[PDB]
Subunit: 364 residues, 4 copies
């Protein structure tokens, strides 16, 4: 039944109109300055970068999405095997369902069978931390897939509008996270889920020992929109209320600036509406360490292995083109390349006390 | 015949296209910063707040609309009984008609019969203060409904274009108001009617002892538009002139900033185009103490008691969602939550000498 | 044949699409702050103001348009007789045609016959000053209609694209103007003709002793468009070039700011696209002493006397409404009333070195 | 086969939708201040200017486009003969094809036969400098057309997406260029090709002795678009990636500001999307020494000699009109005339550290 929601989620995300519905990443407001003389050759471009104690081929990750049933595990298989081939890290979807039901475990475990070397990231929702889950559940999630880290997702916006939603975010959960991070053999990443991380949230999480963030800003997959559709579907009145919140959240680009600024030493994934290698390039240039993607990886995976391979080739090429055209020989250079910030993103930063000079020094 | 205009008013407002016609609240320019980690649970959210000497359930009020005839009193009945059930304060429409005609009294008195505990707000138009009305008419309006305060409405824009309009706003009217407030057992609120309160108007009213404002800015019910329709209807040439003024006024958001800034200790209702709980939340976050609504309450009430209940539930849920998603456990926390001001609202404030730093300290 | 151009001009202006074609006044960027408590009554509003040594009923003038043939004189008759009735000043069109041809004189003289008291403004084009015209031609123009002043028009943009155009603006013409102003019994106004006066032009003219300006900015009648149409009409290749210049010029609102700022003591008419009393009020509030109108007066006059009366009633009402709703009891109060400048007009002023603070003090 | 690409290029550029596709010059953000009193006569306007050691009639050049085959040479003939007639300088297309194939030489040599006096500009791509080309190939390109200068084009964006593209821009190429410039009898211009020159690229090139730049910014011919079409055509998957980059680059107007600011003493051609004499006027006023055009010259040339003559007449007239209407008697006065910078261009400059005051002094 939670397994039913899991299938609905995938199905609405993949086949309904929810990608960037009434929302925006603000990435249009970020421009990478073109360099007519790059000072490099396309083939000397190096996209390698660190992901905790591993090295990855490309500063892009697949962020967590699914699992909990066979056809979901078959998707997870296709993602993992292609991700392995390309040397790119992969998060799995929430493993709650696999803690609750042993039959769901294989649909997550398959990932490490087929992807023995890339970093694999576990997944549990923050609401579970106030509702009982602790160190052991974490370790179970981790060891079930021999994870190199665990993502704990923030999704209060989704919980609020979800028909069976659990909108529980008492501060107690953070004390518990901080305790759990004491005893855990792998690092914790805290990630949003389409509504983005603000500087207040990031600073709070940092004061509790969290150093790793995944922005998951608005403008990509709209989870409020997904839950609105679930509400429409079962005649729940919450639907029209969700409609008013469709553009709620921190835009991805704003979130990248906010986290990088307020926690300069953070390890930062920039995600939420990353749809090309250009987007990936802007996110990293803006301040992220890596770019994250979910929805378009799902869509390709559903079409098949080769379709997903073609997708990744395209992203990689697009990334390397932005690198080439900015004179960025490696990921480090991309992080310090020249940008222009315009429009609404500019105004958002000014209002939020983000001094653009100290910001340029911070991102490098 | 004034009774006739009362019916026309309700009819055009309810059934014609006058809500936000060529006007804007500027509320799009106000963004509430999303908090991925709220630090609270949805069910611990407390929406209680003070309304003079009473406590109300929710920082929303129904602002004055109608009365003066039976079908109008039946509307007033539906609004009051539902308002009572929800613990939300209700203003009545202008009581002028009930001073002039004793048959109209019941359509206002019904309100206290059916709503014995919530705050009820009396209503008289400022033009009447230069045209004879004083202490005794105020007390009649007040005691006719056992009001907890009296709203005095400003509507010069309406009076200008009204076919039978009385555009009389001599300063003598404020001298009188200030005298009347000496002798009155309840506080006075001064409210606009779709065209908003500026810092000049607010400062002037304050210098006459007025401490309670209701912004009633543009972007909601367009009273110029209503009067234009009345003019078109009776071939009056004023109609085309009204058309040029459709976007005249201080937008609600700008008005909230203006009043809060220029009179920091004011008790402020933010109204004019509040259409959702999100709207209500933005207005409070911006600087209002409570949000006000009129037109959508009318529209629901006309559909029936249960429709109006469903409406209020929706508003309340929406409000609580905005509070949840900003980490606001109570109304006080909402007033100090993080916001972004962009666009035309930003430019309005900059031009008007509203320093954004001293503004942030003021709204707290 | 110049008389032919005169009818073509009136015909294209009146019946073709040239009013604000691809151009803008920027008056959208000017907002008059609404006052919910005006502090005055509509009927105590006083719209009287000085126009040189005369008093006029309303701070609006009809700026020069036509003359030179019978049906043109009949239009001039209708404008003058209605202007007389309302106590509003009237400029006539260029009197060049009547210096060149004695048969054309009656079509200008008719104006003083039928309007014995209002200020009447003569008209000659600046190119004529480099092409022979001097003191005597000026006195003829003036005494032909017992003018209270003479308007010398700037129209180089028009002359450039006019098929028979005379784009001659040597500085010599200003030396001559300054000499002519020595000997003249009435003051000189320098006015543009749909392309606006900049601070460079206004300072230059002032340095030659010109104190009276009429902005005639873009966003109203488009004279480049009119000449383009004349070019299309006679297969002249200049037509497509004109098309690229359709939005050439200083927008009316920018021109008002520019002139007022760079020559603070100027007597300033704000015109070019004034279409309502609201427009008229913005131009005055912005910094003009009076608002000017041409095209919509022409259009009404062509429909007839009573149509033009209805037009002027409408303008006056609209003006008084803007006065009422800003608490402006008289024209002076309107000149110092509260405004907001937004958008492109704000950017224009910032770039041009118009300090908004010293600007507010200057317009008062 | 390189000769095949040469005809494809011309064919797609002339007949497909690639001019300003999803791109912008930012020239809309630049406004020339209209002068109602120019202080000059249209016929005294002098458009003569220097182009290295020659004098040219008009501050406009035709920038390099084509050559390499007969029907291409016949185009080059039409361009050169008309350019000769008007006294405007002409660049030829890349001469690579004529170094590689002796049969292609005539299609470039024809230019000097028919245009013995105007400046003619040679052309070689930067990629060729990394791939073997040196002093002798340069001299062959120069002497083949008795060139007055050689343009070295930057096109890494095009190379990246070109199906047979050579995206090689190692810094080694600049050491080589600086060496070649030692031994060369004519000066070197470095020009972009639709994607614009940034301050980083311009400062780099200057450090290597390059003093002459041609912006070729975005907003005109979109070379990424042309290669996208070539990719679509041969089913190459790079096509969809190109689609994401259609708006990549420095907008022409931004590029002009960037180069002029970061190398104040540069000789600067402003090109990319120059489509009228007004555009040409803005680019010069902004900071360029001359305006450059390619695409619309090609399109006219294909129609024929007389069509191209009519084109140039129109450009010249448009230029002189902008000069007339700003009071610019000669090209120098145009360079210091009054402008307004608004919008996105303004934001671009502010972010890039272009101080608008020091900028106004630098362009004069
Ligand atoms: C079908 C599906 C299912 C999920 C997700 C996504 C989608 C598309 N996402 C959120 C995801 O990881 C990401 O943070 C947001 O989707 C924003 O990225 P995109 O715009 O989708 O690239 C997600 N997040 C997570 O932490 N736990 C979860 O189980 C899921 N579930
Ligand atoms: C039919 C109807 C009738 C009235 C009103 C409204 C409507 C819709 N309003 C104005 C109202 O209280 C409020 O200030 C404005 O309508 C702006 O809020 P809304 O945009 O309608 O929520 C109103 N105001 C008041 O002070 N006295 C009055 O009697 C009336 N009459
Ligand atoms: C048919 C017609 C004829 C003329 C004009 C106008 C029209 C519509 N205008 C220009 C006019 O006075 C005014 O400056 C501009 O038209 C801008 O104002 P409007 O937008 O038309 O109100 C004009 N100006 C002037 O100084 N001398 C002239 O003879 C004329 N001729
Ligand atoms: C058909 C064709 C072919 C070429 C070009 C253009 C066109 C239209 N351009 C680029 C040109 O010189 C210019 O820099 C850009 O086209 C931008 O200017 P326009 O927007 O076209 O005026 C060009 N540039 C160059 O340096 N070498 C080349 O051979 C070509 N080839
Ligand atoms: C986008 C996300 C984070 C999907 C998880 O939503 P759920 O609320 O269905 O996740 P669990 O309850 O199964 O953790
Ligand atoms: C929107 C408002 C304020 C309605 C009141 O209009 P009226 O002008 O009919 O009010 P009274 O004259 O009855 O006070
Ligand atoms: C809009 C205006 C100023 C009309 C005058 O144009 P003309 O150029 O025909 O005027 P004269 O030559 O008759 O002065
Ligand atoms: C816009 C430009 C610079 C066209 C040159 O493209 P190519 O890449 O076809 O030029 P060559 O290889 O022939 O130099
Ligand atoms: Mg959950
Ligand atoms: Mg009234
Ligand atoms: Mg003339
Ligand atoms: Mg090449």
């Amino acid at each position: 039944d939670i397994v039913n929601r899991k299938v609905e989620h995938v199905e609405i995300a993949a086949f309904e109109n929810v990608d960037g519905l009434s929302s925006s990443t603000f990435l249009n407001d970020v421009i990478l300055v073109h360099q007519g003389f790059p000072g490099i050759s396309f083939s000397e471009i190096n996209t390698k970068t660190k992901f905790f104690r591993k090295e990855i081929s490309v500063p892009v990750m697949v962020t967590g999405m699914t699992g909990g049933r066979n056809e979901l595990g078959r998707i997870n298989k296709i993602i993992a095997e292609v991700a392995e081939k390309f040397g790119i890290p992969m998060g799995v979807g929430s493993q709650r369902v696999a803690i609750e039901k042993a039959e769901a475990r294989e649909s997550f475990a398959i990932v490490r069978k087929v992807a023995p070397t890339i970093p694999i990231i576990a997944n549990l929702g923050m609401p579970q931390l106030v509702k009982g889950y602790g160190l052991k559940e974490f370790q179970d999630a981790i060891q079930m897939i021999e994870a190199d880290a665990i993502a704990v997702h923030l999704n209060p916006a989704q919980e609020v509008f979800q028909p069976e939603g659990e909108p529980e975010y008492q501060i107690y959960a953070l004390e518990k996270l901080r305790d759990i991070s004491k005893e855990l053999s792998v690092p914790i990443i805290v990630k949003e889920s389409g509504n983005g991380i603000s500087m207040e949230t990031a600073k709070l999480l940092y004061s509790y020992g969290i150093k790793n963030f995944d922005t998951s800003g608005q403008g990509g997959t709209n989870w409020i929109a997904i839950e609105m559709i679930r509400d429409i579907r079962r005649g729940n009145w919450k639907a029209e209320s969700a409609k008013n919140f469709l553009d709620w959240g921190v835009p991805t680009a704003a979130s990248i600036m906010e986290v990088r600024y307020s926690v300069p030493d953070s390890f930062l994934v920039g995600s939420g509406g990353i749809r090309s290698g250009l987007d990936a390039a802007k996110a990293i240039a803006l301040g992220a360490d890596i770019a994250g993607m979910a929805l378009p990886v799902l869509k390709s995976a559903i079409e098949g292995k080769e379709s997903l391979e073609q997708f990744f080739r395209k992203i990689i090429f697009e990334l390397k083109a932005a690198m080439m055209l900015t004179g960025s020989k490696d990921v480090d250079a991309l992080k310090k390349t020249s940008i222009v910030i315009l429009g609404k993103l500019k105004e958002w930063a000014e209002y939020r006390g983000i001094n653009l000079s100290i910001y340029e020094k911070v991102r490098k």
